[PDB]
Design a protein around this ligand. Structure first.
Ligand code: FAD
Ligand code: FAD
Lengths: 333, 330
């Protein structure tokens, strides 16, 4: 049972960012991550994925992302970056470890792994991301649909959908990008809640970051899809049928497959039992967005806007990582 | 959407055995497996694990296990075997693929992967093993125990248990072996339902095939260190330990469940094949499913053939299953 000052849970961009700042502190720490390789959830993104901002705009603290081959970073490059980042700062990343549970051990916290390894931490920084909690909504008659379903989290390639009629549900960047790729081999139908909003052709995802005083980027395959005229959105249906869907007015479309691009929740099963997870799947944090209210020794990092505006982006996590790390450095004194 | 005659789900020793025979049939087939590497659930066994029979007695069809360095095969050798086995027979193993669902598509079956890939099969041989469905029983007050728990499926090394009081629950070969290893660094207590029965010192796991727990070297050792005393189940758990019928209390820092597994058949839910006992209802041969004739099952344990869930004993059922389906495809 190692005693450390800080345990960081999750070894993605968020955890590596926390790491960079903890290195410059005087504190003893470790970073626990469940994956086989470095790179967080990017290891699970689909093959064609590219970022929506250039390398300079996709960089975490200190060492920036190397310039990419094309205008936008490819999935591969993001992995290469995050790999080389750990080495560059020789960060204490133990991998693979699945943290099962964090629980009270007197004044400190006890972090337990699936295989019985244990750590004793004065502080914990949860940086586990969202990929692990894919969200599918509940629609009437869904349990009856005979076709194929998957979440965007497991989308990989358009091939399997060749020649099918396919519903893409969700109107974010993901929906748009996957719609773009699947429309190349399938009769496609984009189902969105509100009619989608595209940024301008001459601008990129850095814009979403610039709203940090407090929608979807025209990345090349999206430009292409627009030009092929497949970016028409339709409102949600009313019911699912065994073979398709049905709308308010009674119009019926058949589908062979459905791809849920309906987002994710924070992956905080390891904090259940500390009673920190709200029924909305978040935690209640202080005004800085970072520190948990019900248990002062737990900080959270990188999860999304409730945990800091644009914290769930490469560029935007840096600020909160700094703040979280100086906050805990104070706590350890 | 590939049409094949037979889809084998699971690329462990069971699936490779089904594979060996399907190769000698004239049939088109494929083997889908979820893991990163070959070797099935042996990739997940703990570091010190050795088999309880020699190599000759741990072999699947055709090409036998190479002789091992020591008297019993080590985890590493088992993986090496199963790796080379696939190359030797150039078996059609697609990996990694997670089969989500098998469902009716007219006369045939439709096998669907998590990422949308699809196959159209006249027949399906489920060989997904048990590792994926670890079983922990439900004891009173368990939710309250403050210490550490894991199933044997995630046991790895004794180090984390150094200096603790530790309960080992389950009295199989696993319990015994894990007890043997963890007793080297921890005050240990073996909790079993039935007082455990050891085979004789001069015999090994081949005996179990000739139809309880084998005296493999670390177990001999543990016997000699006097740590193989079993105790009956407790009555309830406390936050810091357990309590027996008579009211005696022992404290524990950790608990390791060696209480077995169920068959991993989530992919057959929805065909309504999975009994509430976690099995499926099969014909007299033990292999073919009753409620859906196009589904065979292989390697899952005694209900699916005596000693089917062993390296040596799966061979027979693989052959039988494969000749059964070869008949069905005609
Ligand atoms: C399709 C898609 C496109 C995106 N595009 C962009 C983009 O173009 N630009 C951009 O800035 N952002 C983008 N993001 C968002 C954000 O950059 C990613 O979500 C990124 O994955 C978040 O990094 P993270 O560390 O917060 O989460 P992750 O990278 O998911 O998480 C890090 C790690 O924590 C580990 N973990 C979780 N639980 C445990 C546990 N119990 N024990 C140990 N380890 C654990 C996980 O396995 C994972 O390795 C995109 C996201 C998606 C889904
Ligand atoms: C601790 C322990 C010790 C043992 N010791 C011995 C011994 O000494 N001698 C002996 O003969 N036997 C022993 N066995 C038993 C048996 O030999 C092994 O259990 C073996 O792993 C069973 O072979 P299998 O192929 O049926 O299962 P596995 O090897 O677990 O299964 C093969 C594959 O099915 C895959 N799979 C599951 N679901 C899906 C899906 N939905 N889609 C795609 N792929 C899937 C799994 O990923 C897995 O790789 C032992 C078992 C255990 C647990």
């Amino acid at each position: 049972m190692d005693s450390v000052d800080v345990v960081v849970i999750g070894g993605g961009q968020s955890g590596l960012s926390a790491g960079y700042f903890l290195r410059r502190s005087g504190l003893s720490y470790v970073i626990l991550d469940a994956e086989a390789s470095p790179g967080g959830a990017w290891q699970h993104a689909w093959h064609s994925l590219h970022l929506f901002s250039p390398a300079g705009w996709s960089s975490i603290p200190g060492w920036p992302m190397p310039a990419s081959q094309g205008p936008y970073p490819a999935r591969a490059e993001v992995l290469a970056y995050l790999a080389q980042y750990e080495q560059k700062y020789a960060l204490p990343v133990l991998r693979p470890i699945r943290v099962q549970r964090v629980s009270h051990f007197g004044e400190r916290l006890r972090v337990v792994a699936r295989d019985g390894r244990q750590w004793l931490a004065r502080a914990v920084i949860s940086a586990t991301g969202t990929w692990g909690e894919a969200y599918t909504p509940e629609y009437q008659g869904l349990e009856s649909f005979a076709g194929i379903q998957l979440h965007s989290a497991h989308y990989s390639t358009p091939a399997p959908f060749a020649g099918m009629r396919v519903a893409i549900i969700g109107g974010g960047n993901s929906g748009a990008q996957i719609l773009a790729e699947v429309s190349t081999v399938a009769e496609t139908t984009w189902i969105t809640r509100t009619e989608p909003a595209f940024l301008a052709d001459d601008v990129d995802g850095r814009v979403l970051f610039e709203r940090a005083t407090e929608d979807i980027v025209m990345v090349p395959p999206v430009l292409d899809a627009r030009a092929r005229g497949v970016l028409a959105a339709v409102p949600p249906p009313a019911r699912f049928s065994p073979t398709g869907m049905q709308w308010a007015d009674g119009t019926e479309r058949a589908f062979d497959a459905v791809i849920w691009c309906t987002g994710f929740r924070p992956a905080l099963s390891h904090l259940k039992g500390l009673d920190l997870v709200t029924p909305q799947g978040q935690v209640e944090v202080d005004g800085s967005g970072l520190r948990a209210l019900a248990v002062p020794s737990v900080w959270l990092l990188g999860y999304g806007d409730w945990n800091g505006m644009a914290s769930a982006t490469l560029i935007g996590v840096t600020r909160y990582a700094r703040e979280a790390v100086r906050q805990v450095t104070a706590y350890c004194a």
